[PDB]
C-alpha cells in the first residue's frame, strides 16, 4: 500500500588524496533508480532501474546539475564541520544526508524528512512539522541558528510536500510492474543436528518484496527473542529479498517451536510447524 | 527528482 522516495548522499574526505568521494543514490521503496559517483568517468547521474531510462535528456541533464550542486555543498560541509569540532586536517571524516517523502495507500503525502549525520551520528534533522530542527549537539546548534536565519525549512517543506510527492507518483506509475507489486515470501524451515542432543531450526523467507518482514520463533506460544539469531534482510540481486531466523534447541523438543512470518503479501500471517 | 544548503 504505502510508498517512499528517498535520496541518500555520502561524502568522505580523503586528506592529501584529492577531493572528497561523493556518492548519491535514489530509491523508490526498496528499488534503486539512480546513482552518481564522483570517482566515475561519466560525471553523470545514471539510471539504475529500467523504468527511469525513458526519462528524456532534460531530466538527465537537470539531475546531473543538481547532484553536482549537492556534491559541492558537502565538499564545503566537510571543511566547516572540521572547524566546528576542532578536528585535524589529516583524518578522514564522513557526512551523510538523506531526504524524501512517504505517501500512504491513496498516494497522498504522509511524512517528509531531511536528516544529516557527521561521522555516523545524528547531526541535524528536520522535525515532523517541517518547520523546525532537532540539533544533536552544540556544533549542530550553530547550523540550526544559520538555517533558521536563512529560512531553510521553508524551502525544504515546499519540495517535500509537493515536488517529492509528484515525482514519486510519476515513478510509481511508470514503473508500475516493478514498483506496485508485492511478492509474498516463500517460506520453509530447515533442521540440522549440531550434536547428538541439539538441533538448529532455521526459518526462511525467500523471494519477497518489499523488504519489510517480521520472522519470529515461539516456544509453546512464548516468544524466543533473546534466543533467536536474526540476520539482516538481504537482497537476492533480482529485485527480491531474503531473511532467516534461527534457534538452537534440544533434540526432541522440535514440536514445541513454531516460526511466524508477517509480510504485506501474505493474505494472513503464516505459522510454520514441525508437525 | 532531486531538490533550490550548507552547514
Amino acid at each position: 500500500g504505502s510508498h517512499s522516495m528517498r535520496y541518500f548522499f555520502t561524502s568522505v574526505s580523503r586528506p592529501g588524496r584529492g577531493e572528497p568521494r561523493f556518492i548519491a543514490v535514489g530509491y523508490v521503496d526498496d528499488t534503486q533508480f539512480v546513482r552518481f559517483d564522483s570517482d566515475a568517468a561519466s560525471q553523470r547521474m545514471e539510471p539504475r532501474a529500467p523504468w527511469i531510462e525513458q526519462e528524456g535528456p532534460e531530466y538527465w541533464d537537470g539531475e546531473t546539475r543538481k547532484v553536482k550542486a549537492h556534491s559541492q555543498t558537502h565538499r564545503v560541509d566537510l571543511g566547516t564541520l572540521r572547524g566546528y569540532y576542532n578536528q585535524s586536517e589529516a583524518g578522514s571524516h564522513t557526512v551523510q544526508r538523506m531526504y524524501g517523502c512517504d505517501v500512504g495507500s491513496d498516494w497522498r503525502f504522509l511524512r517528509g524528512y531531511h536528516q544529516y549525520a557527521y561521522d555516523g551520528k545524528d547531526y541535524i534533522a528536520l522535525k515532523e512539522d517541517l518547520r523546525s530542527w532537532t540539533a544533536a549537539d552544540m556544533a549542530a546548534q550553530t547550523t540550526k541558528h544559520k538555517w533558521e536565519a536563512a529560512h531553510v525549512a521553508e524551502q525544504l517543506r515546499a519540495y517535500l510536500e509537493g515536488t517529492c510527492v509528484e515525482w514519486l507518483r510519476r515513478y510509481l506509475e511508470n514503473g508500475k510492474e516493478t514498483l506496485q507489486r508485492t511478492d509474498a515470501p516463500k517460506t520453509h524451515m530447515t533442521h540440522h543436528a549440531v550434536s547428538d542432543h541439539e538441533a538448529t531450526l532455521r526459518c526462511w523467507a525467500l523471494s519477497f518484496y518489499p523488504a519489510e518482514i517480521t520472522l519470529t520463533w515461539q516456544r509453546d506460544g512464548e516468544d524466543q527473542t533473546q534466543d533467536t539469531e536474526l540476520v539482516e534482510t538481504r537482497p537476492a540481486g533480482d529485485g527480491t529479498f531474503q531473511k532467516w531466523a534461527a534457534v538452537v534447541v534440544p533434540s526432541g523438543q522440535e514440536q514445541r517451536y513454531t516460526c511466524h512470518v508477517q509480510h504485506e503479501g501474505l493474505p494472513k500471517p503464516l505459522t510454520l510447524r514441525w508437525e | 527528482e532531486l531538490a533550490x544548503l550548507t552547514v
Partner: protein, 100 residues
Amino acid sequence: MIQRTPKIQVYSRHPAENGKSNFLNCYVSGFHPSDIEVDLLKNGERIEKVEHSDLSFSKDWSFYLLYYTEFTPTEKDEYACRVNHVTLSQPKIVKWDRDM
C-alpha cells in the same frame, strides 16, 4: 569516532544445484565508516569479475553493499567472502554454506 562492524552474509541468489548457473552474493551491512575491502573467493583465490551495488545506508546511518558474481556451483568448489574494515583486526573470511 563511531565505528560499526560489518555483518557479512555469503549466499546464493537461488537454491544451489550443481551444474546450474546461479549468482554468488556477499552482502555486508551495518558498517561504519564506509571504507571496506570485500572479495569473493573460489578455492581461496580472488574472483576477478565481481560487481557491487552503489554505496547506500540504513536509517541508523550504517552502510550496506552487495558484491556479486555469476557462478555455477559444483561438488568440489569452495566459495567464500573475505572482508577487511577498520573494526576487524585481521580480514574475516566467511565460507559459503549451501545447506543452511
